[PDB]
Amino acid sequence: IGAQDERLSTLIHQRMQEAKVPALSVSVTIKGVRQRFVYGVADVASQKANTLDTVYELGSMSKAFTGLVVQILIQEGRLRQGDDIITYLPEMRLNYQGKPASLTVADFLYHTSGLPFSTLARLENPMPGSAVAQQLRNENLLFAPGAKFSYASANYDVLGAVIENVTGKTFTEVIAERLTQPLGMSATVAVKGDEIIVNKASGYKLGFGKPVLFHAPLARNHVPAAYIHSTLPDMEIWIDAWLHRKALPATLREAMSNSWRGNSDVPLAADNRILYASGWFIDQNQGPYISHGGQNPNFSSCIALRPDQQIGIVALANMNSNLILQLCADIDNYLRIGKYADGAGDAITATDTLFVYLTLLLCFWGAVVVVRGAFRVRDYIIALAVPGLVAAMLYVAPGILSPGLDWRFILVWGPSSVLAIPFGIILLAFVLTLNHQI
Ligand SMILES: *[B]([O])([O])[C]([C]C([N])=O)[N]C(=O)[C][C][C][C][C]
Ligand SMILES: [Cl-]
Ligand SMILES: [Cl-]
Ligand SMILES: [Cl-]
């Protein structure tokens, strides 16, 4: 062989410096020749380095593990795609137009279920003795099952429970017995909680311009959608199984083939005719190009394969960034035509700089009132009610402007600077009524 590609290393350094992720691990496969780029720190405080041993949360790239398991179960005749979900989760009643709806296993595999957006807030919150069927019971679907593609993370939590019901085994054990042990992915695992994982990267999240350590929720029921843990050597083996199925058992080979068959039975938009398969996006354009991003509150990742060209790309990072969600598109552009686009924008970054300006704008306002005021019973009670009256209005405001949304969800996904905005808003109300009391 020969050296790794330096134009390729520059791209990734640039994207990593843009995205401000503490650690970034990328692997690129092109017909056996793997290139590896392993940069940064898995833990910033201890200055613990990013190594090949570092473990990441895969985000939505967990769904291809879940979905392939479903396809193994189907291929062994222990399940059908058209089976009704209530056959396996019999307490899950899901409503469309007031009537219980028929949802097939296919409906959750391909996001044609109609679960509202707020099911992500419900599944991602830990609840110890609460099953998925009980958490979604009496949800009001957005459309008739099968009618539209609409991505909801929680559809793959429904499938986690379906695996658990069919096999009689826990989700961890089906993933191990069926995927990671037969493939050799000896460091990958579906977790059961926030128990201590050796070598896991610390997760970060933008706050006042810098990465801030964030301990994110890890709800057991949400692991089939968001919290399978893995490493770069193991995603390389993953990538390589999907690309070379000959050595694999015939059930795994067949299950894989049916895992890349996109659902063509949904409406398509004028600019998006990409299909969804069993945890993958399918694009015939400059393809087939099979891809999926990973996006957790404090990890992001991406994967993309171009099987006819023996190409696999995967990137892992311990911070949620769109520069990483797009990084596989960048690398595939580079491997295809030698050029790539400028880095896209990031929604957490724009929100953070907005909150910094608003925090300085709130902080400039209070100092004006305190300087002009200091230079110059009923007072204590009245000037304490108004800040608590705004604090009350602020607390109810999410669950009104967007039903099903709440501060707990805002805090989990937004910048660490969110909390400055209500606290700034209510603190500014106290100094003004105390000043208006003066
Ligand atoms: B997946 O689509 O990357 C999914 C994984 C998860 N944590 O459930 N992530 C999202 O859908 C991102 C939702 C952002 C909400 C503001
Ligand atoms: Cl089994
Ligand atoms: Cl257990
Ligand atoms: Cl092959």
Author numbering: 36 to 411, 430 to 491
Quote what the paper states about this structure.
To design a specific inhibitor of colibactin biosynthesis, we targeted the colibactin-activating enzyme ClbP. This membrane-embedded periplasmic serine peptidase is essential for the genotoxicity of pks+ E. coli.
To address this need, we designed and characterized a series of boronic acid-based inhibitors of colibactin biosynthesis. Using biochemical assays and crystallography, we show that they engage the ClbP binding pocket, forming a covalent bond with the catalytic serine. In this structure, the d-Asn side chain of the inhibitor projects into a tight-fitting pocket and hydrogen bonds with the side chains of residues S188, H257 and N331. N331 also hydrogen bonds to E92, setting its orientation and helping to enforce ClbP’s selectivity for d-Asn- over d-Asp-containing substrates. The inhibitor-bound structure of ClbP also reveals continuous electron density from the S95 side chain to the ligand, indicating essentially complete conversion to a covalent protein–inhibitor complex. This boronate complex is a structural analog of the tetrahedral intermediates formed during amide bond hydrolysis and participates in several stabilizing interactions that are likely relevant to the activation of precolibactin. The backbone amides of Q330 and S95 hydrogen bond to one of the boronate oxygen atoms and are thus well positioned to stabilize the negative charge that accumulates upon formation of the covalent bond with S95. In addition, Y186, which is part of the catalytic triad that defines this enzyme family, is positioned to stabilize this complex by donating a hydrogen bond to either the other boronate oxygen atom or the oxygen nucleophile on the serine side chain. Thus, the potency of these ClbP inhibitors arises both from their ability to mimic the hydrogen-bonding interactions of intermediates in the hydrolysis of precolibactin and the formation of a covalent bond with the catalytic serine residue.
